[model samples]
Target: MLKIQAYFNETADLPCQFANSQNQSLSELVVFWQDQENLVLNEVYLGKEKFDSVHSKYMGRTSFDSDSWTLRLHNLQIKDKGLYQCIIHHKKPTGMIRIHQMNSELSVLA
Candidate 1:
């Protein structure tokens, strides 16, 4: 019921939105994109972007929109077809922890 389709050699736009239900602050927040293989494609830690941790396969081919939290993945390929998940974790005050998540499946057509 949830899927995104794209053609080879094109770009795929994955949508994600953050929920600051606990609080509006992003302090100590961590957000990332994970594939079916559990590989980390992009990451933002402690309110900072972490490009160094991106997987080799996605190096230089990924972009994140800070405002919308959408991931722009370029250079689509057959192997790139899989489930993509955006996970955000934050520690809130009053001894509470919250996680916001978004997910979509990618089906590539040759």
Candidate 2:
């Protein structure tokens, strides 16, 4: 897990990286971001383009970088403070997808 602190109305970047232990490209995987409440913030599939399933409240304020898989939250608010997670689903050799996640705790101050 990672910890981050920011002032209200600022911007913060939540890290979400996916790479195989062999340092292989993650282009075949899917990445997603969710809030503390398990609300889907956003996602990207096939390593390109954003999905339309993002929560309306977060639509314009959040951006996802396909290359690094980082989630950037703009104009931070107290309501946004809490836990966020980056989940990666990787295709496996057995034709099954494996789940991996990273958590970040954001603390927004006045």
Candidate 3:
């Protein structure tokens, strides 16, 4: 876990690594970005975005950047001050298996 600071209305770039698993095929990976607990801001599965399941408050404000392998929260709000987790997993024939993860503490301030 790490700490991150963001100004009000600015974007926050939280980090992660898929170095070891960079060879994964398209849709072989599942990515989930959460504002801790059950509030998920974004998800990437089947090599695409799953927008319907995002929390209403976070819709349109968050996204997963494949280039950076990072989760970005835009127009940060005070309520966004919390732990953000990037859960990465692999899709296997047997089941979904956990692989990589990155998390940060976001402090939204003016």
Name the top TM-score candidate. Answer: 3
lDDT of 3 by residue, 2-92 (tens): 8999899899988765565457764798888877776888889868999988989898987777888888889888878988788888889
Candidates' C-alpha lDDT: 0.80, 0.79, 0.82
Candidate 1 clashes between residue pairs 3 or more apart in a chain or in different chains = none
Q: Which candidate is the best by lDDT?
A: 3
**Candidate 2: RMSD to truth:** 2.4
Off by over 4 Å in 2: 17-19, 22-26, 92-96
lDDT of 2 by residue, 8-97 (tens): 999999887555463545577777899988888877775675757788878788888766668999989988999999987775655636
Clashing pairs in 2: none
Give per-residue CA lDDT, model 1, range 11-96, as digits (tens). Answer: 89887656455554545677789888888888877677798888899998888776777888899998899989888777455443
As a whole number from 0 to 100, the lDDT of residue 6 in candidate 3 is 86
Question: In candidate 3, which residue ranges exceed 4 Å CA deviation?
Answer: none
RMSD after Cα superposition, model 1: 2.7
Q: TM-scores across all candidates?
A: 0.82, 0.83, 0.89
By TM-score, the candidates rank as: 3, 2, 1
